[PDB]
Structure formats: structure tokens, C-alpha cells
């Protein structure tokens with residue numbers, strides 16, 4: 022239930038934070054999908070986090086490790 | 101002359117987590133560790149969304165693995 | 179598709195990787211589909227073990243897959259499957275030094291069966307580029323003659339291969355390849 | 369000359385810790401197998417007829433000449 026922050030100023034729209042998030046990958050890549058909500062979607066060229074109320078993230082670091090030009094900061098402390 | 105056994109080997113008892121990698125794989129069955137917890141853990145593989153090897157990365161006792169993909173001419177429909 | 183992993187289905191019976199369906203099953207299924215829908219043209223068929231000696235046996239094995247169908251459509255056709263470039267499928271023998279023609283056997287089977295129509299792939303004895311949708315044949319040809327080779331795998335669908343080749347007159351292999359198509363055409367009763 | 373018996377070897381380093389010829393590579397440990405498995409590599413450029421490592425092996429996995 023952590024909080025992710027995306028630096029819009031250096032986001033290129035690469036979409037490798039959307040493809041690599043394992044909560045996004047739940048809908049289409051799971052047998053009998055449990056939850057179909059998504060943290061990121063690239064609207065107007067930058068990654069927007071729809072997870073406003075910080076309910077779905079799990080601090081995995083797959084998205085921080087994925088962005089090619091580090092731009093996603095993961096906060097492990099309560100918002 | 102018989103036997104050599106030069107030195108001495110011990111297990112830092114405040115660090116062992118009772119994984120048993122060393123007892124299961126010791127050549128001479130000379131290690132005696134007993135797991136602190138007992139129970140069962142099950143993995144529903146059909147619900148993992150693929151590229152999320154967080155469980156593999158964080159398992160202390162490296163019990164978890166990504167089952168290696170078979171080669172071609174060996175997949176046999178599975 | 180096994181070429182997409184790097185293998186080839188060298189006969190009619192071996193299974194596809196991960197699919198465990200066979201060339202025989204897929205040919206039969208497509209024939210049933212085609213004659214059920216009543217499409218104008220039949221199942222045009224390439225075949226297996228292309229371009230190797232001794233594959234007239236396999237050519238007969240793949241031609242025996244139509245023995246239980248009838249061409250039903252509102253258009254006039256008596257085929258149920260069309261076996262193409264058969265001078266390529268009518269080789270015989272073990273290798274390229276004990277290599278002769280099986281056109282006699284192929285056309286005996288075709289002259290028997292009336293639901294099988296063919297065409298010849300007569301080689302015109304010149305320089306040419308060979309393009310077939312199957313990879314393994316082109317790769318094998320490249321490893322034979324050490325000339326260019328292009329491969330275009332499609333996604334969830336087919337393969338490809340382009341390789342120049344010299345069908346020159348100064349080779350026993352090319353001479354016999356030329357003779358085979360003429361034997362096929364001149365052994366045709368119909 | 370040298371010959372290991374992979375049938376009776378446990379991949380214990382006590383054979384490659386002695387001679388500079390025997391280098392024992394343990395390929396990475398994975399719960400897949402749950403076992404230790406590697407290879408024993410012997411180079412001519414460093415051996416001798418010392419034969420100490422024959423009986424230093426816990427098992428009789430090594431015969432040399």
C-alpha cells in the first residue's frame with residue numbers, strides 16, 4: 022500500500038513501467054484474474070499513477086528497476 | 101594413517117535459519133539442524149503474473165525457484 | 179513452426195513442439211474443413227522431407243491422406259488436394275551419389291487416384307533464387323552451397339527462406355533434377 | 369592418467385583444495401534440483417604422481433596414474 026512518485030519532467034513515455042508492474046500484469050496474464058485495477062497508464066506521454074489512494078502497490082521495485090532513465094522514486098515510509 | 105580432519109567447523113547458532121540446505125546436502129550426514137516452524141506452504145502457479153520474481157529475490161532460504169523452461173522437442177504439450 | 183525453434187518435421191508422423199499435433203492430423207483437418215465449406219480450390223499442399231533423396235516414400239505417405247474424401251462444391255473440381263512441385267518430392271535413393279528418380283512410382287499412384295491432381299516443378303537449368311515459405315529446406319540448401327540466405331519468420335503463422343542457387347548443366351544432380359520433371363509429365367495418362 | 373568417478377563423487381572441495389591442478393566448479397545452487405552438482409577439472413600442467421588426493425577424497429572417487 023506504498024506510494025510511488027513519477028518525475029514527469031524526465032518521463033519519456035517508454036511504457037516499460039506499465040508493462041512491468043506485476044499489479045498491472047494481473048488482468049491479462051493470470052488465470053481467473055483477481056483484481057483488474059492498474060497503477061500506471063501513459064497519458065499524454067508521461068506515466069500517470071491511477072493508484073491515487075495508495076492501495077495496490079506492493080513495494081516490489083519491478084517498476085523502479087524497469088524505467089531506463091531512473092525517474093520513479095519508491096517511498097517505503099507511510100505517506 | 102587413518103584420518104586427517106585438519107581444523108574445526110561449527111554453525112553460528114544465532115545466524116542459522118534452519119533452512120537445512122547444509123544438512124540435506126552434507127556429504128557425511130554430520131549436521132543436525134531442526135526447523136523452528138512446521139506447517140505447509142502452497143504456490144498456485146496459475147496466478148503469478150509472470151515477471152515478478154520478488155518472492156524469489158526475497159526468500160531467505162532460497163526455497164523458491166523459477167522452474168526452468170524446457171527446450172523444444174521436450175516440452176511435450178506441457 | 180518447429181523451425182521457429184530450429185527443428186524440422188522430417189516425416190509425416192512426428193509431433194510439433196509443444197502442440198503434439200502431427201502433419202498427418204493437420205492435413206486431414208484442413209481437408210475436412212475445406213471440403214466442408216466447399217471452397218473453390220482444394221487444399222494446395224507442399225509436403226514434407228522436401229529436397230532430399232529417398233522422399234518418394236514420404237510423398238506417397240502424404241498423398242495417401244485423401245483416400246476418404248469427395249470434392250463437394252457448386253464449382254466443378256475433382257481434386258480434393260493438390261500436390262505441388264512434385265519433381266521436388268519425387269526423389270529416390272540415400273544421398274546425392276546414389277540418387278535416382280521416383281517419378282514412375284509417384285505417377286503410378288497419381289494415375290491410380292482420381293481425387294489427386296498435381297503439377298510439375300520442371301527445372302529450367304539456369305541461375306535462380308529459390309523462395310519457399312519453409313525455413314528448414316532453405317537453411318539446408320544454404321549449408322550445402324555456401325551462398326546468401328535470408329530468413330523471415332512471421333508471428334504465429336509461417337516461416338520463409340530465400341537462397342540463390344545454380345541449376346547448372348555441369349552437375350549430375352541438376353541433370354537428374356531436370357530429367358525428373360519430364361518423366362513425371364511424360365508418364366501422365368491423364 | 370587422471371580419472372574421476374562422477375558416480376561416487378559428492379563434489380566436496382577436499383580434492384580440489386589440495387592440488388593446484390584440480391579446480392572444482394560448483395554451478396549455481398538452485399532449489400530446482402535441491403542438490404550440489406558441478407564438475408572436477410584436472411590440468412596436466414600442474415600434476416605429479418603424488419596421489420595424495422586419491423585418498424584425501426572422502427569417497428574413492430579418484431584413481432590416478
Ligand code: SF4
Pocket residue numbers: 025041042043044045060077078079080081082083084085095
Ligand atoms: S512497486 Fe511493484 S506493485 Fe508497486 S507500482 Fe511498482 S511494480 Fe507495481
Ligand code: SF4
Pocket residue numbers: 027031032033034035036037038039063067068087088089090092093
Ligand atoms: S518507465 Fe520511466 S520513463 Fe518510462 S513511462 Fe515509466 S516513468 Fe516514464
Ligand code: SF4
Pocket residue numbers: 111115116117118119120121122123133
Ligand atoms: S545452510 Fe541453513 S541450516 Fe545450515 S547453517 Fe546455513 S542457514 Fe543454518
Ligand code: SF4
Pocket residue numbers: 043147148149150151152153154155156
Ligand atoms: S512475487 Fe512471486 S508469487 Fe508473488 S506475484 Fe511475483 S511471481 Fe507471483
Ligand code: SF4
Pocket residue numbers: 372376377378379380381382383384392408424425426427429430
Ligand atoms: S574427488 Fe573426492 S573430494 Fe574431490 S570433489 Fe570428488 S568426492 Fe569430493
Ligand code: SF4
Pocket residue numbers: 386387388389390414415416417418419420421422432
Ligand atoms: S595426484 Fe597429486 S598433484 Fe596430481 S592432482 Fe592429485 S594431489 Fe594434485
Ligand SMILES: [Zn+2]
Pocket residue numbers: 224262263310311
Ligand atoms: Zn513449395
